[PDB]
Amino acid sequence: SLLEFGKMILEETGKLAIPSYSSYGCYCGWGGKGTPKDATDRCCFVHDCCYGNLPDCNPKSDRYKYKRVNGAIVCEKGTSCENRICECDKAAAICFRQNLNTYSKKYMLYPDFLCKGELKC
Ligand SMILES: O=C(O)Cc1ccccc1Nc1c(Cl)cccc1Cl
């Protein structure tokens, strides 16, 4: 659920889901349209897509359990949705961690009209 994802984010990037990633680029936090502005934005685009493969699930509210073996994120067995949701969030976290070096504040609160064009998953 949104609750786990943010915590996962924080541990991974040292940044807070809100407001560091809740309104970044064209896909972080609300998604919808345009061309992902950067790597971090790309992470969100993929992440939205991931959630997309689970029409009959509820990512925002279904909670899952996970542990860190050492530095690694390991999703614990739960419902199928729960497991596939976790794998989606884990990917996004690692992704964020992998592009922290290019995170740009000029993309915080990015205005909607500056996101043109559809991009397929
Ligand atoms: O893909 C993302 O960056 C995350 C993302 C996508 C869709 C919806 C919400 C979020 N994040 C989000 C979180 Cl992670 C916590 C509190 C409030 C919000 Cl809106």
Residue ranges and CATH numbers for the domains of the chain are 1-121 (1.20.90.10)
DSSP reduced 3-state for 66: strand
User: What is the SS3 assignment for 26?
Assistant: coil
- For residue 64, CA distances in Å to 35, 70, 79, 88, 109 come to 31, 19, 8, 12, 29
Cross-strand partners of 74: 67
Report the pocket of ligand 1 as residue ranges, CB < 6 Å.
2, 5-6, 17-18, 21-22, 28-29, 44, 47-48, 92
Amino acid at 106: K
Burial class (CB in 10 A: 0-12, 13-18, 19+), 56: exposed
Partners of residue 3 on adjacent β-strands: none
User: Do the beta carbons of residue 36 and residue 42 sit within 8 Å?
Assistant: yes
- What is the rounded CA–CA span in Å between residue 4 and residue 112? 27
Rounded to an integer, what distance in angstroms lies between the CA atom of residue 81 and that of residue 57?
Answer: 6
**Angle at the Cα of 5 (from 4 to 11), degrees rounded to 5?**
90
> Residue 71 annotated as binding?
no
Please name the method used to determine this structure. X-ray
Distance 24 CA to ligand 1 centre (A): 10
Residue 89 appears among annotated catalytic residues: yes
Q: At what angle do helices 80-99 and 2-13 cross, to 10 degrees?
A: 30
Q: How far apart are CA 25 and CA 4, in angstroms?
A: 22
Rounded to whole angstroms, the Cα distance separating 15 from 108 reads: 13
Residue 69: C-alpha distances to residues 7, 60, 80 (Å): 16, 25, 21
Measured in Å, how far apart are the chain's first and last C-alpha atoms? 22
Catalytic status, residue 56: no
Nearest to 100 by CA among 30, 32, 10, 33: 10
